[PDB]
UniProtKB/Swiss-Prot annotation:
Although the ATP-dependent helicase activity displayed by the INO80 complex requires INO80 ATPase activity, it is likely that the helicase function is carried out by the other components of the complex, RUVBL1 and RUVBL2, and not by INO80 itself. The DBINO region is involved in binding to DNA. Component of the chromatin remodeling INO80 complex; three different complex modules assemble on different domains of INO80. Interacts with DDB1. Interacts with transcriptional repressor protein YY1; the interaction recruits the INO80 complex to YY1 target genes. Interacts with YY1AP1. Interacts with tubulin alpha. ATPase component of the chromatin remodeling INO80 complex which is involved in transcriptional regulation, DNA replication and DNA repair. Binds DNA. As part of the INO80 complex, remodels chromatin by shifting nucleosomes. Regulates transcription upon recruitment by YY1 to YY1-activated genes, where it acts as an essential coactivator. Involved in UV-damage excision DNA repair. The contribution to DNA double-strand break repair appears to be largely indirect through transcriptional regulation. Involved in DNA replication. This is Chromatin-remodeling ATPase INO80. Belongs to the SNF2/RAD54 helicase family. It comes from Homo sapiens (Human). Disulfide bonds: none annotated. It is found in: Cytoplasm; Nucleus; Cytoplasm, Cytoskeleton, Spindle; Chromosome. According to PubMed:10574462, widely expressed. According to PubMed:16298340, specifically expressed in brain, liver and pancreas.
Length: 41
DNA sequence: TGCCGAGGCCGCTCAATTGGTCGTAGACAGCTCTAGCACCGCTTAAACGCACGTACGCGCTGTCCCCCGCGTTTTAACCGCCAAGGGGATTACTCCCTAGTCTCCAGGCACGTGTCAGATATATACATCCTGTGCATGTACTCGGGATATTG
């Protein structure tokens, strides 16, 4: 929905393996305009 | 009474192990070496093991004779404990430096041969050093009496 309606923005996943979470934390260590997250994380 | 508050059972979601499947890369097993030099077989003249009273050396033996063992219990603090406090050993993160890879590149030297000598072995003659024996004292010991040190 972000990619179809607002290609003006850039979006970060934040779920899955601890490795992928740890890696993504480097990219938001603000062109990381929005992050998508789950309650359980 | 009331209310409710506190109370006790059951599907998500994530996070190690566990076991499974993929594909690919040297390293293992094996072949033929081949090649050669050790194992063998065959003699020989050779050393050294070995089955075997007797002199006799000492391993084992029958006695008595005593401390250190054997037994008791008081106590004495040794040793254990628990609980608290402080920090320092620990954890999790970010930056950082080099460990490690490969690659090129040389010559140092460990490798190898090529000759043949000063070395040490072996014999005979032998003298001498060294062992086994026999043989005095000199001390290091065991005891008794008193002085100094140290525990309670």
């Amino acid at each position: 929905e972000f990619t179809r309606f607002v290609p003006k923005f850039k979006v970060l996943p934040y779920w899955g393996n601890p490795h992928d979470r740890k890696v993504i934390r480097r990219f938001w260590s603000a062109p990381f305009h929005v992050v998508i997250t789950s309650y359980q994380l």
